[PDB]
């Protein structure tokens, strides 16, 4: 879930 409010979780930023 949203277990870390500091993390960007947009998949475009990690796998694009």
């Amino acid at each position: 879930l949203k277990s870390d409010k500091k993390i960007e979780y947009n998949e475009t930023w990690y796998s694009r």
Epitope: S3, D4, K5, K6, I7, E8, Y9, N10, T12, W13, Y14
Partner: antibody, heavy 129, light 111 residues
């Protein structure tokens, strides 16, 4: 000059809805997460919500599920939709720019450091029967 | 691991110093950056100190920040009547996964 000009707010009934908006200028909008922080009359500050540059959204426990934050990077605008309003939601609401631009570290992208260097003028939200 | 504990009020003499404390735990103050905000009457808060002891641009050096264990402190020297405001500490809590504010400290300048 950095400006965060808020609009919206006002009065609602318990269970009703209100929309807040924040217009940002004077800085690179897409480099910073933007938060909402509220303050009940004569009370202290409480972090409400955050939206990151990439659209990641986080909320305080008391408003999760009832509040929806969103942003438009092409319009340099931000909005907070507030549904299922409760009496304890009565407060002045500020939009607040994160003081730290998003950054990459240790394999993860970080939206900001949850400190606020610029604040909007504040908009009053009252929830009452 | 709690809500940051600040004394409701603090006072100091003009031209003298005052120290506002902020007590937390190991998961917030003890392991994370502390920030301090000043809020004048009827105005929005203003970032006063960041990263435990750093001063933003335009903050005079008579405002100082420090940290020790699970506590943090904001020191104000050369007290002026304009310094009367509410002062808030703030820190991340990794146990709660939440940003925390202190309850605020209302500063009175005597005289």
């Amino acid at each position: 000059e950095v400006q965060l000009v808020e609009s919206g707010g006002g009065l609602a009934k318990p269970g009703g809805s209100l929309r807040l908006s924040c217009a940002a200028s004077g800085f690179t909008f897409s480099r910073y997460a933007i938060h909402w922080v509220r303050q009940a009359p004569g009370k202290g500050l409480e972090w409400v919500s955050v939206i990151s540059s990439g659209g990641s959204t986080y909320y305080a426990d008391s408003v999760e599920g009832r509040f929806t934050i969103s942003r438009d990077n092409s319009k340099n605008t931000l909005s907070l939709q507030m549904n299922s309003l409760r009496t304890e939601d009565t407060a002045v609401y500020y939009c607040a720019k994160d003081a730290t631009p998003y950054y990459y570290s240790g394999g993860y992208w970080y939206v900001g450091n949850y400190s606020f260097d610029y604040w909007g003028q504040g908009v009053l939200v009252t929830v009452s029967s | 691991q709690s809500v940051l504990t600040q004394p409701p009020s603090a006072s100091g003499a003009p031209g003298q110093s005052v120290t506002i404390s902020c007590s937390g735990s190991s998961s917030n103050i003890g392991s994370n950056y502390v920030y301090w905000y000043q809020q004048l009457s009827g105005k929005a808060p203003k970032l006063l100190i960041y990263n435990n002891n750093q001063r933003p641009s335009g903050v005079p050096d008579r405002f100082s920040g420090s940290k020790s264990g699970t506590s943090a402190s904001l020191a104000i020297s050369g007290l002026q009547s304009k310094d009367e405001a509410d002062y808030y500490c703030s820190a991340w809590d990794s146990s709660l996964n939440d940003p925390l504010f202190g309850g605020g400290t209302r500063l009175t300048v005597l005289g």
